[PDB]
């Protein structure tokens, strides 16, 4: 069932960011969505989308997850020819994650694949890969 | 620099699977690759690919990671009209992970996004999502 | 083997700027690269590239080194958009250095040529040449 | 105006090599040139060229320096008794150095870039690079 | 990762020749290379290249190794007094070694084939073949 | 003169596999060949070919050696014909070795090059290279 999810950010001391749910997954067209509600306006909310859809062509199940972390732009009180500007997004950092699981697969295989993903993302080589934006020479 | 990466599988007690490197990332066309070497033939090797490529159109850096976990099929000593069969793959479970990081982003933003990914993948909602193949109702 | 390089800027009291290795050279095509990471964004990094490449045509070995020092443009919050733009580079100061070493080249000759280069660049005539942008009339 | 330049060669104790000014910088067309004039043949004169020219289109100042160190060779070793083989130029070790300084450039930026160049060339990584003939892997 | 390699030359008592790693294997494109760096000239460096690449079409792994031993020659014997003739490369003795291992290949088969190669090269028939320059009639 | 060659396979306790001479080399066109005769049928023989050939173009002498180790496919009585097929080869592991020896080549240089080859193939880096199919990263 759906409840908010708590993700610890990247710092010395992690600070838990809570994503409260906004949508349940309906059918396979619509993914379930979670919003952080940290900043005052919507543009500052961090987003989490998750969709489990069965693909009958491949006789398999797909799992798509997305994490959108937006950072707002630095504003100024005096905007040209008009009003003080509403807060806007300067850029946003996404993660996309896609698991695919065939129909003939084991519960053990699913646990294997998920643990491989989480342990790699913890691993220092993934940290080198994303934080330093560096290849593997 | 490149060294093998150790990922703990999904069990009661994790069993470390070691991926020894086979390729370094060359340019942006070619991703760096790691092979598990657990099974006797190649088809049983588990794979890990990682590529950091700068996309100049979006003025940003992309990071693509893939984990391929194949399970072999159950063979029989007597194959029709010929020889005992070589081990073949029955199916394979992949993860794909894509980070994108704009040029104007902070080291803090990169650490944030990676920690969000790893903490979610550890989270029980991600476990519900992949292991049980269940939506969020 | 690759390891960060520490160069001292020109001032009253010079400061050690450390170029951490961000990409190594394992092939002949693409040079090795070091990134400073003083500024918070990728644009503000100081760069150092170094390629050693055997040229079979001249039966020789070329060594190309480049040092890029960018001066980030002062970015103020927009007078028109009210929205401070992502940090940009107003201009960059490069050095390019090329050594060529023939196949019949003594270790002593290599030491000689590197010494002439470094001692000239330290020399007050090189200072008159680059710092004061003055020729020898 | 123009003055001869003395550089320390690479040895246990550096031996000052003096480059006499044999021609000064014409203007913006022909670079200034200095000649060591140590060897008895004109072959073994070491050379130094330096030119400072403002590219008005690019609104910048280019500074080009070159150091030419020749190594000679005779058909057969010298006897000091009869007519002996005149020496050929076996090879030449050049350094080329180029600075480019945009027109709206600080004197402090010029000092910075020259310092980065000279401190790097003194650095042991530059020594591993050029003297040892080994790239950074 | 990559480590220098020491080979015993042919003499009454073998003299260990150490090949330092001057460049590692790029990926699947450029082989790893090792340099002896014993002789004073760059001519007399002995070379070792090794590349391991999976041909995906042929479903196999190629392993290519090459050993380059140069022998130098001067126009006239050295005097140690005056300017002397720089040395030319008289000739080079290469070995090329290629293994191909199909994808469905046993680790025991790999051990077998490498053992056959090494034991043969140690064998006195290989010695009669290559050292003595005499075929098997 | 031709005589059988005895090579030791890689195992716990290595076994001497004897290649009996089955065809000698008396001409330059076709190499000499040795057959193992372990298996009962011709397909299961291990092969060794060796050609020493003077190349007048390069004023040199080439030596080509090849070792073919076939792994016979497990042949079970037909599931369809009920008739076990004649034994076939599922795959084969070759080694190819090429020495080239110029006309001006010292006996000592030949000993050197054969020694470098054999000692490298014995070397643990060669084992990491072929047995583990791993590059030098
Ligand atoms: Ca490396």
PDB file of N, CA, C and O in Angstrom, chain C residues 34-95:
ATOM      1  N   UNK C  34      43.499  16.717 -15.803  1.00  0.00           N
ATOM      2  CA  UNK C  34      43.421  17.018 -14.383  1.00  0.00           C
ATOM      3  C   UNK C  34      42.518  18.229 -14.195  1.00  0.00           C
ATOM      4  O   UNK C  34      42.588  19.187 -14.975  1.00  0.00           O
ATOM      5  N   UNK C  35      41.694  18.189 -13.146  1.00  0.00           N
ATOM      6  CA  UNK C  35      40.682  19.198 -12.858  1.00  0.00           C
ATOM      7  C   UNK C  35      40.924  19.811 -11.484  1.00  0.00           C
ATOM      8  O   UNK C  35      41.248  19.097 -10.532  1.00  0.00           O
ATOM      9  N   UNK C  36      40.757  21.135 -11.374  1.00  0.00           N
ATOM     10  CA  UNK C  36      41.145  21.807 -10.135  1.00  0.00           C
ATOM     11  C   UNK C  36      40.049  21.767  -9.079  1.00  0.00           C
ATOM     12  O   UNK C  36      40.337  21.534  -7.900  1.00  0.00           O
ATOM     13  N   UNK C  37      38.800  22.027  -9.470  1.00  0.00           N
ATOM     14  CA  UNK C  37      37.646  21.970  -8.568  1.00  0.00           C
ATOM     15  C   UNK C  37      37.678  23.061  -7.494  1.00  0.00           C
ATOM     16  O   UNK C  37      37.082  22.904  -6.425  1.00  0.00           O
ATOM     17  N   UNK C  38      38.352  24.185  -7.752  1.00  0.00           N
ATOM     18  CA  UNK C  38      38.272  25.306  -6.819  1.00  0.00           C
ATOM     19  C   UNK C  38      36.870  25.910  -6.819  1.00  0.00           C
ATOM     20  O   UNK C  38      36.187  25.923  -5.789  1.00  0.00           O
ATOM     21  N   UNK C  39      36.409  26.390  -7.977  1.00  0.00           N
ATOM     22  CA  UNK C  39      35.053  26.911  -8.109  1.00  0.00           C
ATOM     23  C   UNK C  39      34.030  25.795  -7.865  1.00  0.00           C
ATOM     24  O   UNK C  39      34.375  24.611  -7.884  1.00  0.00           O
ATOM     25  N   UNK C  40      32.758  26.148  -7.589  1.00  0.00           N
ATOM     26  CA  UNK C  40      31.748  25.103  -7.343  1.00  0.00           C
ATOM     27  C   UNK C  40      31.203  24.407  -8.586  1.00  0.00           C
ATOM     28  O   UNK C  40      30.744  23.263  -8.491  1.00  0.00           O
ATOM     29  N   UNK C  41      31.224  25.072  -9.741  1.00  0.00           N
ATOM     30  CA  UNK C  41      30.670  24.514 -10.969  1.00  0.00           C
ATOM     31  C   UNK C  41      31.775  24.071 -11.923  1.00  0.00           C
ATOM     32  O   UNK C  41      32.921  24.516 -11.834  1.00  0.00           O
ATOM     33  N   UNK C  42      31.397  23.193 -12.860  1.00  0.00           N
ATOM     34  CA  UNK C  42      32.374  22.604 -13.774  1.00  0.00           C
ATOM     35  C   UNK C  42      33.087  23.665 -14.601  1.00  0.00           C
ATOM     36  O   UNK C  42      34.257  23.482 -14.959  1.00  0.00           O
ATOM     37  N   UNK C  43      32.410  24.778 -14.905  1.00  0.00           N
ATOM     38  CA  UNK C  43      33.001  25.810 -15.756  1.00  0.00           C
ATOM     39  C   UNK C  43      34.203  26.474 -15.096  1.00  0.00           C
ATOM     40  O   UNK C  43      35.129  26.914 -15.789  1.00  0.00           O
ATOM     41  N   UNK C  44      34.201  26.571 -13.771  1.00  0.00           N
ATOM     42  CA  UNK C  44      35.248  27.246 -13.039  1.00  0.00           C
ATOM     43  C   UNK C  44      36.457  26.409 -12.708  1.00  0.00           C
ATOM     44  O   UNK C  44      37.367  26.890 -12.024  1.00  0.00           O
ATOM     45  N   UNK C  45      36.497  25.161 -13.160  1.00  0.00           N
ATOM     46  CA  UNK C  45      37.655  24.321 -12.907  1.00  0.00           C
ATOM     47  C   UNK C  45      38.821  24.780 -13.768  1.00  0.00           C
ATOM     48  O   UNK C  45      38.639  25.187 -14.917  1.00  0.00           O
ATOM     49  N   UNK C  46      40.021  24.723 -13.205  1.00  0.00           N
ATOM     50  CA  UNK C  46      41.233  24.880 -13.992  1.00  0.00           C
ATOM     51  C   UNK C  46      41.632  23.511 -14.530  1.00  0.00           C
ATOM     52  O   UNK C  46      41.468  22.497 -13.845  1.00  0.00           O
ATOM     53  N   UNK C  47      42.136  23.480 -15.764  1.00  0.00           N
ATOM     54  CA  UNK C  47      42.402  22.212 -16.432  1.00  0.00           C
ATOM     55  C   UNK C  47      43.875  22.049 -16.781  1.00  0.00           C
ATOM     56  O   UNK C  47      44.585  23.025 -17.058  1.00  0.00           O
ATOM     57  N   UNK C  48      44.311  20.787 -16.783  1.00  0.00           N
ATOM     58  CA  UNK C  48      45.653  20.417 -17.222  1.00  0.00           C
ATOM     59  C   UNK C  48      45.578  19.150 -18.068  1.00  0.00           C
ATOM     60  O   UNK C  48      45.160  18.106 -17.570  1.00  0.00           O
ATOM     61  N   UNK C  49      45.996  19.233 -19.333  1.00  0.00           N
ATOM     62  CA  UNK C  49      46.010  18.091 -20.244  1.00  0.00           C
ATOM     63  C   UNK C  49      47.446  17.727 -20.617  1.00  0.00           C
ATOM     64  O   UNK C  49      48.296  18.607 -20.775  1.00  0.00           O
ATOM     65  N   UNK C  50      47.702  16.428 -20.780  1.00  0.00           N
ATOM     66  CA  UNK C  50      49.047  15.923 -21.046  1.00  0.00           C
ATOM     67  C   UNK C  50      48.962  14.631 -21.845  1.00  0.00           C
ATOM     68  O   UNK C  50      48.370  13.646 -21.386  1.00  0.00           O
ATOM     69  N   UNK C  51      49.582  14.645 -23.026  1.00  0.00           N
ATOM     70  CA  UNK C  51      49.598  13.522 -23.956  1.00  0.00           C
ATOM     71  C   UNK C  51      51.034  13.222 -24.356  1.00  0.00           C
ATOM     72  O   UNK C  51      51.725  14.092 -24.895  1.00  0.00           O
ATOM     73  N   UNK C  52      51.477  11.993 -24.104  1.00  0.00           N
ATOM     74  CA  UNK C  52      52.735  11.482 -24.637  1.00  0.00           C
ATOM     75  C   UNK C  52      52.375  10.450 -25.698  1.00  0.00           C
ATOM     76  O   UNK C  52      51.623   9.501 -25.429  1.00  0.00           O
ATOM     77  N   UNK C  53      52.886  10.656 -26.911  1.00  0.00           N
ATOM     78  CA  UNK C  53      52.450   9.907 -28.084  1.00  0.00           C
ATOM     79  C   UNK C  53      53.645   9.609 -28.971  1.00  0.00           C
ATOM     80  O   UNK C  53      54.372  10.527 -29.362  1.00  0.00           O
ATOM     81  N   UNK C  54      53.850   8.334 -29.290  1.00  0.00           N
ATOM     82  CA  UNK C  54      54.938   7.975 -30.187  1.00  0.00           C
ATOM     83  C   UNK C  54      54.489   8.216 -31.623  1.00  0.00           C
ATOM     84  O   UNK C  54      53.475   7.665 -32.061  1.00  0.00           O
ATOM     85  N   UNK C  55      55.221   9.067 -32.339  1.00  0.00           N
ATOM     86  CA  UNK C  55      54.991   9.309 -33.758  1.00  0.00           C
ATOM     87  C   UNK C  55      56.002   8.471 -34.536  1.00  0.00           C
ATOM     88  O   UNK C  55      57.204   8.767 -34.528  1.00  0.00           O
ATOM     89  N   UNK C  56      55.515   7.414 -35.189  1.00  0.00           N
ATOM     90  CA  UNK C  56      56.398   6.517 -35.925  1.00  0.00           C
ATOM     91  C   UNK C  56      56.918   7.143 -37.211  1.00  0.00           C
ATOM     92  O   UNK C  56      57.949   6.698 -37.728  1.00  0.00           O
ATOM     93  N   UNK C  57      56.230   8.163 -37.731  1.00  0.00           N
ATOM     94  CA  UNK C  57      56.658   8.804 -38.971  1.00  0.00           C
ATOM     95  C   UNK C  57      58.020   9.465 -38.805  1.00  0.00           C
ATOM     96  O   UNK C  57      58.962   9.179 -39.555  1.00  0.00           O
ATOM     97  N   UNK C  58      58.141  10.354 -37.822  1.00  0.00           N
ATOM     98  CA  UNK C  58      59.395  11.027 -37.516  1.00  0.00           C
ATOM     99  C   UNK C  58      60.309  10.196 -36.625  1.00  0.00           C
ATOM    100  O   UNK C  58      61.369  10.691 -36.223  1.00  0.00           O
ATOM    101  N   UNK C  59      59.927   8.953 -36.328  1.00  0.00           N
ATOM    102  CA  UNK C  59      60.622   8.117 -35.353  1.00  0.00           C
ATOM    103  C   UNK C  59      60.920   8.930 -34.096  1.00  0.00           C
ATOM    104  O   UNK C  59      62.070   9.146 -33.712  1.00  0.00           O
ATOM    105  N   UNK C  60      59.852   9.426 -33.483  1.00  0.00           N
ATOM    106  CA  UNK C  60      59.996  10.384 -32.401  1.00  0.00           C
ATOM    107  C   UNK C  60      58.864  10.187 -31.405  1.00  0.00           C
ATOM    108  O   UNK C  60      57.995   9.329 -31.577  1.00  0.00           O
ATOM    109  N   UNK C  61      58.880  11.004 -30.357  1.00  0.00           N
ATOM    110  CA  UNK C  61      57.865  10.967 -29.315  1.00  0.00           C
ATOM    111  C   UNK C  61      57.488  12.402 -28.984  1.00  0.00           C
ATOM    112  O   UNK C  61      58.347  13.187 -28.568  1.00  0.00           O
ATOM    113  N   UNK C  62      56.219  12.746 -29.176  1.00  0.00           N
ATOM    114  CA  UNK C  62      55.728  14.073 -28.845  1.00  0.00           C
ATOM    115  C   UNK C  62      55.104  14.081 -27.455  1.00  0.00           C
ATOM    116  O   UNK C  62      54.535  13.084 -26.996  1.00  0.00           O
ATOM    117  N   UNK C  63      55.234  15.219 -26.779  1.00  0.00           N
ATOM    118  CA  UNK C  63      54.635  15.442 -25.469  1.00  0.00           C
ATOM    119  C   UNK C  63      53.935  16.793 -25.528  1.00  0.00           C
ATOM    120  O   UNK C  63      54.596  17.831 -25.661  1.00  0.00           O
ATOM    121  N   UNK C  64      52.606  16.782 -25.438  1.00  0.00           N
ATOM    122  CA  UNK C  64      51.787  17.988 -25.475  1.00  0.00           C
ATOM    123  C   UNK C  64      51.150  18.223 -24.112  1.00  0.00           C
ATOM    124  O   UNK C  64      50.444  17.352 -23.586  1.00  0.00           O
ATOM    125  N   UNK C  65      51.385  19.404 -23.554  1.00  0.00           N
ATOM    126  CA  UNK C  65      50.836  19.803 -22.269  1.00  0.00           C
ATOM    127  C   UNK C  65      50.068  21.100 -22.464  1.00  0.00           C
ATOM    128  O   UNK C  65      50.497  21.979 -23.218  1.00  0.00           O
ATOM    129  N   UNK C  66      48.921  21.210 -21.805  1.00  0.00           N
ATOM    130  CA  UNK C  66      48.100  22.408 -21.883  1.00  0.00           C
ATOM    131  C   UNK C  66      47.559  22.743 -20.503  1.00  0.00           C
ATOM    132  O   UNK C  66      47.137  21.852 -19.761  1.00  0.00           O
ATOM    133  N   UNK C  67      47.578  24.028 -20.164  1.00  0.00           N
ATOM    134  CA  UNK C  67      47.054  24.521 -18.891  1.00  0.00           C
ATOM    135  C   UNK C  67      46.026  25.600 -19.195  1.00  0.00           C
ATOM    136  O   UNK C  67      46.376  26.661 -19.731  1.00  0.00           O
ATOM    137  N   UNK C  68      44.763  25.336 -18.854  1.00  0.00           N
ATOM    138  CA  UNK C  68      43.669  26.277 -19.072  1.00  0.00           C
ATOM    139  C   UNK C  68      43.263  26.890 -17.734  1.00  0.00           C
ATOM    140  O   UNK C  68      42.782  26.174 -16.843  1.00  0.00           O
ATOM    141  N   UNK C  69      43.443  28.213 -17.603  1.00  0.00           N
ATOM    142  CA  UNK C  69      43.006  28.961 -16.426  1.00  0.00           C
ATOM    143  C   UNK C  69      41.837  29.853 -16.820  1.00  0.00           C
ATOM    144  O   UNK C  69      42.041  30.889 -17.470  1.00  0.00           O
ATOM    145  N   UNK C  70      40.600  29.495 -16.487  1.00  0.00           N
ATOM    146  CA  UNK C  70      39.468  30.350 -16.844  1.00  0.00           C
ATOM    147  C   UNK C  70      39.197  31.381 -15.763  1.00  0.00           C
ATOM    148  O   UNK C  70      39.381  31.135 -14.570  1.00  0.00           O
ATOM    149  N   UNK C  71      38.765  32.562 -16.194  1.00  0.00           N
ATOM    150  CA  UNK C  71      38.322  33.594 -15.264  1.00  0.00           C
ATOM    151  C   UNK C  71      36.808  33.703 -15.403  1.00  0.00           C
ATOM    152  O   UNK C  71      36.308  34.195 -16.420  1.00  0.00           O
ATOM    153  N   UNK C  72      36.081  33.210 -14.404  1.00  0.00           N
ATOM    154  CA  UNK C  72      34.626  33.208 -14.478  1.00  0.00           C
ATOM    155  C   UNK C  72      34.103  34.630 -14.566  1.00  0.00           C
ATOM    156  O   UNK C  72      34.542  35.512 -13.824  1.00  0.00           O
ATOM    157  N   UNK C  73      33.163  34.854 -15.477  1.00  0.00           N
ATOM    158  CA  UNK C  73      32.519  36.155 -15.545  1.00  0.00           C
ATOM    159  C   UNK C  73      31.762  36.416 -14.251  1.00  0.00           C
ATOM    160  O   UNK C  73      31.105  35.522 -13.706  1.00  0.00           O
ATOM    161  N   UNK C  74      31.885  37.649 -13.754  1.00  0.00           N
ATOM    162  CA  UNK C  74      31.046  38.110 -12.655  1.00  0.00           C
ATOM    163  C   UNK C  74      29.585  38.030 -13.067  1.00  0.00           C
ATOM    164  O   UNK C  74      29.126  38.788 -13.925  1.00  0.00           O
ATOM    165  N   UNK C  75      28.821  37.185 -12.389  1.00  0.00           N
ATOM    166  CA  UNK C  75      27.418  36.945 -12.724  1.00  0.00           C
ATOM    167  C   UNK C  75      26.553  37.587 -11.646  1.00  0.00           C
ATOM    168  O   UNK C  75      26.580  37.158 -10.489  1.00  0.00           O
ATOM    169  N   UNK C  76      25.813  38.628 -12.024  1.00  0.00           N
ATOM    170  CA  UNK C  76      24.852  39.340 -11.201  1.00  0.00           C
ATOM    171  C   UNK C  76      23.429  38.917 -11.556  1.00  0.00           C
ATOM    172  O   UNK C  76      23.163  38.548 -12.704  1.00  0.00           O
ATOM    173  N   UNK C  77      22.497  38.950 -10.598  1.00  0.00           N
ATOM    174  CA  UNK C  77      21.108  38.591 -10.911  1.00  0.00           C
ATOM    175  C   UNK C  77      20.543  39.491 -11.995  1.00  0.00           C
ATOM    176  O   UNK C  77      20.727  40.710 -11.971  1.00  0.00           O
ATOM    177  N   UNK C  78      19.843  38.867 -12.942  1.00  0.00           N
ATOM    178  CA  UNK C  78      19.429  39.547 -14.161  1.00  0.00           C
ATOM    179  C   UNK C  78      18.727  40.853 -13.842  1.00  0.00           C
ATOM    180  O   UNK C  78      17.931  40.944 -12.903  1.00  0.00           O
ATOM    181  N   UNK C  79      19.071  41.879 -14.609  1.00  0.00           N
ATOM    182  CA  UNK C  79      18.344  43.132 -14.520  1.00  0.00           C
ATOM    183  C   UNK C  79      17.011  43.029 -15.238  1.00  0.00           C
ATOM    184  O   UNK C  79      16.048  43.714 -14.874  1.00  0.00           O
ATOM    185  N   UNK C  80      16.928  42.156 -16.239  1.00  0.00           N
ATOM    186  CA  UNK C  80      15.691  41.961 -16.979  1.00  0.00           C
ATOM    187  C   UNK C  80      14.878  40.769 -16.487  1.00  0.00           C
ATOM    188  O   UNK C  80      13.693  40.918 -16.184  1.00  0.00           O
ATOM    189  N   UNK C  81      15.491  39.592 -16.381  1.00  0.00           N
ATOM    190  CA  UNK C  81      14.747  38.431 -15.913  1.00  0.00           C
ATOM    191  C   UNK C  81      14.598  38.399 -14.398  1.00  0.00           C
ATOM    192  O   UNK C  81      13.747  37.662 -13.888  1.00  0.00           O
ATOM    193  N   UNK C  82      15.392  39.183 -13.672  1.00  0.00           N
ATOM    194  CA  UNK C  82      15.455  39.028 -12.235  1.00  0.00           C
ATOM    195  C   UNK C  82      16.046  37.713 -11.786  1.00  0.00           C
ATOM    196  O   UNK C  82      15.975  37.393 -10.597  1.00  0.00           O
ATOM    197  N   UNK C  83      16.645  36.953 -12.701  1.00  0.00           N
ATOM    198  CA  UNK C  83      17.032  35.564 -12.479  1.00  0.00           C
ATOM    199  C   UNK C  83      18.508  35.427 -12.827  1.00  0.00           C
ATOM    200  O   UNK C  83      18.873  35.445 -14.010  1.00  0.00           O
ATOM    201  N   UNK C  84      19.353  35.284 -11.806  1.00  0.00           N
ATOM    202  CA  UNK C  84      20.793  35.201 -12.019  1.00  0.00           C
ATOM    203  C   UNK C  84      21.134  34.024 -12.926  1.00  0.00           C
ATOM    204  O   UNK C  84      20.721  32.888 -12.646  1.00  0.00           O
ATOM    205  N   UNK C  85      21.884  34.240 -14.006  1.00  0.00           N
ATOM    206  CA  UNK C  85      22.192  33.139 -14.917  1.00  0.00           C
ATOM    207  C   UNK C  85      23.203  32.192 -14.301  1.00  0.00           C
ATOM    208  O   UNK C  85      24.011  32.576 -13.450  1.00  0.00           O
ATOM    209  N   UNK C  86      23.143  30.937 -14.741  1.00  0.00           N
ATOM    210  CA  UNK C  86      24.127  29.932 -14.368  1.00  0.00           C
ATOM    211  C   UNK C  86      25.518  30.472 -14.677  1.00  0.00           C
ATOM    212  O   UNK C  86      25.682  31.230 -15.644  1.00  0.00           O
ATOM    213  N   UNK C  87      26.534  30.132 -13.884  1.00  0.00           N
ATOM    214  CA  UNK C  87      27.837  30.786 -14.045  1.00  0.00           C
ATOM    215  C   UNK C  87      28.470  30.424 -15.376  1.00  0.00           C
ATOM    216  O   UNK C  87      28.435  29.268 -15.805  1.00  0.00           O
ATOM    217  N   UNK C  88      29.038  31.437 -16.030  1.00  0.00           N
ATOM    218  CA  UNK C  88      29.636  31.328 -17.354  1.00  0.00           C
ATOM    219  C   UNK C  88      31.095  31.770 -17.300  1.00  0.00           C
ATOM    220  O   UNK C  88      31.561  32.340 -16.307  1.00  0.00           O
ATOM    221  N   UNK C  89      31.818  31.501 -18.387  1.00  0.00           N
ATOM    222  CA  UNK C  89      33.238  31.828 -18.505  1.00  0.00           C
ATOM    223  C   UNK C  89      33.380  33.030 -19.430  1.00  0.00           C
ATOM    224  O   UNK C  89      32.948  32.982 -20.589  1.00  0.00           O
ATOM    225  N   UNK C  90      33.986  34.109 -18.921  1.00  0.00           N
ATOM    226  CA  UNK C  90      34.170  35.317 -19.724  1.00  0.00           C
ATOM    227  C   UNK C  90      35.365  35.190 -20.660  1.00  0.00           C
ATOM    228  O   UNK C  90      35.318  35.673 -21.797  1.00  0.00           O
ATOM    229  N   UNK C  91      36.445  34.571 -20.192  1.00  0.00           N
ATOM    230  CA  UNK C  91      37.592  34.263 -21.033  1.00  0.00           C
ATOM    231  C   UNK C  91      38.476  33.266 -20.298  1.00  0.00           C
ATOM    232  O   UNK C  91      38.285  32.982 -19.109  1.00  0.00           O
ATOM    233  N   UNK C  92      39.459  32.750 -21.027  1.00  0.00           N
ATOM    234  CA  UNK C  92      40.347  31.730 -20.499  1.00  0.00           C
ATOM    235  C   UNK C  92      41.761  31.992 -21.005  1.00  0.00           C
ATOM    236  O   UNK C  92      41.949  32.416 -22.149  1.00  0.00           O
ATOM    237  N   UNK C  93      42.749  31.772 -20.133  1.00  0.00           N
ATOM    238  CA  UNK C  93      44.158  31.942 -20.478  1.00  0.00           C
ATOM    239  C   UNK C  93      44.797  30.569 -20.628  1.00  0.00           C
ATOM    240  O   UNK C  93      44.880  29.815 -19.642  1.00  0.00           O
ATOM    241  N   UNK C  94      45.164  30.165 -21.832  1.00  0.00           N
ATOM    242  CA  UNK C  94      45.891  28.905 -21.992  1.00  0.00           C
ATOM    243  C   UNK C  94      47.397  29.056 -22.142  1.00  0.00           C
ATOM    244  O   UNK C  94      47.912  30.064 -22.658  1.00  0.00           O
ATOM    245  N   UNK C  95      48.089  28.008 -21.690  1.00  0.00           N
ATOM    246  CA  UNK C  95      49.458  27.707 -22.084  1.00  0.00           C
ATOM    247  C   UNK C  95      49.457  26.400 -22.854  1.00  0.00           C
ATOM    248  O   UNK C  95      48.824  25.424 -22.434  1.00  0.00           O
TER     249      UNK C  95
END
